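Researcher: We're reviewing a set of sequences before deciding which ones to prioritize for further study. For each one, I'd like a predicted 3D structure that I can look through quickly. This is Phosphoenolpyruvate synthase. If possible, include the structure in token form so it fits the rest of the review sheet.
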Amino acid sequence: KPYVLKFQEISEALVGGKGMNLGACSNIEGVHVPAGFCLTTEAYKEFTQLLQRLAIREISETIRTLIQHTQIPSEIASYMDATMPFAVLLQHISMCWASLFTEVQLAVVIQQMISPEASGILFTADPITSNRKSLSIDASFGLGESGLVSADSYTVRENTITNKIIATKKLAETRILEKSQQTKQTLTDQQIIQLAKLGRKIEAYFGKPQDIEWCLAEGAFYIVQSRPITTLYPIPEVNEPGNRVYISVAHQQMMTDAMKPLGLSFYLMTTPATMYTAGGRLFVDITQSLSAKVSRDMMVNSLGQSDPLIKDALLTVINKKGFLPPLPTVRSIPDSSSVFELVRNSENSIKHLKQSIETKSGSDLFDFIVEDLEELKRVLFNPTSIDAIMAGMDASAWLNEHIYQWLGEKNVADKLSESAPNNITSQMGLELLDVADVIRPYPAVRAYLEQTKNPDFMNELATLEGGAETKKALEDYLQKYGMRCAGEIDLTKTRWIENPLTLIPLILSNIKNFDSSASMHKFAQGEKEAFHKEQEILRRLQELPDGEQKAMETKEKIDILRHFIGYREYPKYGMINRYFIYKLALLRAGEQLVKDGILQEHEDIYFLYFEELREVVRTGQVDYELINARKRDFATFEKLTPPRILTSDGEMINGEYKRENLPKDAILGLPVSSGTVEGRARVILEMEKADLEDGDILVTAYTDPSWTPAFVSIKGLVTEVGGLMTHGAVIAREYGLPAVVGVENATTIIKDGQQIRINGTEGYIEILD
Ligand SMILES: CCOc1c(C)c(O)c2c(O)c3c(CNN4CCN(C)CC4)cc2c1[C@H](O)O/C=C\[C@@H](OC)[C@@H](C)[C@@H](OC(C)=O)[C@@H](C)[C@H](O)[C@@H](C)C(=O)[C@H](C)/C=C/C[C@H](C)C(=O)N3
Ligand SMILES: [Cl-]
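Model: Here's the predicted structure for Phosphoenolpyruvate synthase, in token form for your review sheet.
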């Protein structure tokens, strides 16, 4: 309402965003903002006509010649002098408003220009490690603003200024310096802590870790600005006692995208692990495991064999005193038939689910889903199915370690795994070549797919020569695999069969990159490499001391390997099959909620967790300000990146590889598929924008099962996450494709188009030019 506002006196649509900060900082205890007033939105009150006008947004800026000359009554321009040189008469306040046009109201704030002996910035959360318990201060003499001027860096955990980076701050309006004054702390230790202690308190009133700008003037740090820190990764709400340690699911699952609440909910309801969510992603609490030596030796070493960065990061946590409490003081192998029966039992379970869920709606559906989740867990964690999965893994490790010990050949199980039978994910990638084989002879169909952006393009094929054949080949493929997609573990993400257009570029690539039967030739060649390797290994073993026994046991392990390693990819397939069936049903409930005028769009269910959504259907009431909050949350979560290790203090820890004799400027990673190749690096985040061709090396954030069709043309693979037995890596071996995973910032360090050499045996990358 009024024309002028002081700062204890202060309404975002009245004095704006930072007009407030000062207002809700004057009231805080022990502090005091620089004093002064604020010119209000109700001072802003022809201009409207030009406004309605909305190259052409080039000269319309004539609007800003207007405020400068427009003048605005001295009344409020002397009403303001009714309540010290400045910064932010009236030359300026007005030219400022103008700012909304080049780009509607703006409020101008004017404060005190004290001559600060020292001035700086303060984070109550360490900018580097994001540890909530570590406070950082950047201080420089006089006014220095941010991050440019030579400034001391102070790291104060609590009363202990641990690390001091006293920069040689040489250039402290006057502009020159005194030499001895130059290398002395900006703030005294008493002042540092006082400000630290100051800083560690303001966060309480505001709530969250704050970014506080301060200035020291004749012995007092009083606050000029207090922005909230919005960049930190959220801590999993686990109030359970004390300090805890979390493992990133995204890294092991080869899928680092943020997930929506509904999708998150379903993964949590499936897992037997003590799992939690944070930043739209999933984390496993392994704290209890680390509370005892025999359990934490097991945990650390078991995870280290997946990816060493976990182990190294865990050791960092363990070596961190004052955090983790101190320590007080052969598997069965199923027969041959099991794999075939495990698949059929899974397939039949899916069939029954389809015939059962189809008759469910409303709360009946949600009651049914909860019941079917038990069946998912039975199929997913069948003791026999686990024995099948571990059978392939155990055989790999046995081979890799015994062959290298006997012959010096490293990771031999890679070559022996090549073209392993009954791998649902491998088949999917190769069978897309067959689809392209059907389309290739038809010119009219190709001219269509090469150009169309119609989501319903499959409904327009019937008019084309070869369209019926093309549509048929596409339908069969989608019946087998249209249930996968990038981020498939998120139930809410769009499946291939919901958007077949996302497969077209891959198909077009296959049509031009290969001839009439690449699938057969690739698979058969793999079968040949694998058998030739087997013969060679067994031959070279029989010339060792009592080698015919070594060869005999190696032959057994090889047979187990090729019989079971392919099944490893199938449990997720069966799980993903239920997830999609769940999705279609939930979508039908969402549409029903829209018809009832309860939801605005049926996809808004994605931002509700299962139990929350279940209550909405039951009660008929939603809180949209929660949904809208979730939508804002998910948006910020996409801008985040999950750390490999997250602590209860919010500290993000990524492991470090131990470089021994590996090339100087080489980029270290985890070797998961043997071989050395040179090729053009292709940095790609979206598979449908991958213009892959012969000689290319795929560099991406992650390769979950859906990425497999992009493997058929590339000569190497580089990812930022993943592990030894995770998705992607297991497919690289069977495709005979050299691969290095767990490469930190690979999509940033490696420039698209660069020639690189990767070593899938030693695990490194070399930039060639
Ligand atoms: C210490 C690691 O902690 C985890 C982490 C980080 C996870 O992400 C775990 C995880 O995603 C799952 C699971 C489901 N497995 N559970 C837990 C262990 N049980 C013996 C069997 C059922 C566990 C995750 C864990 C877990 O707490 O940590 C311990 C072992 C896992 O990490 C090495 C192993 C068992 C891993 O496989 C390996 C390398 O041996 C798990 C994930 C699993 O066996 C792999 C082979 C898998 O693909 C299963 C079939 C996935 C089922 C999907 C379902 C939704 C699920 O809950 N999976
Ligand atoms: Cl189109």
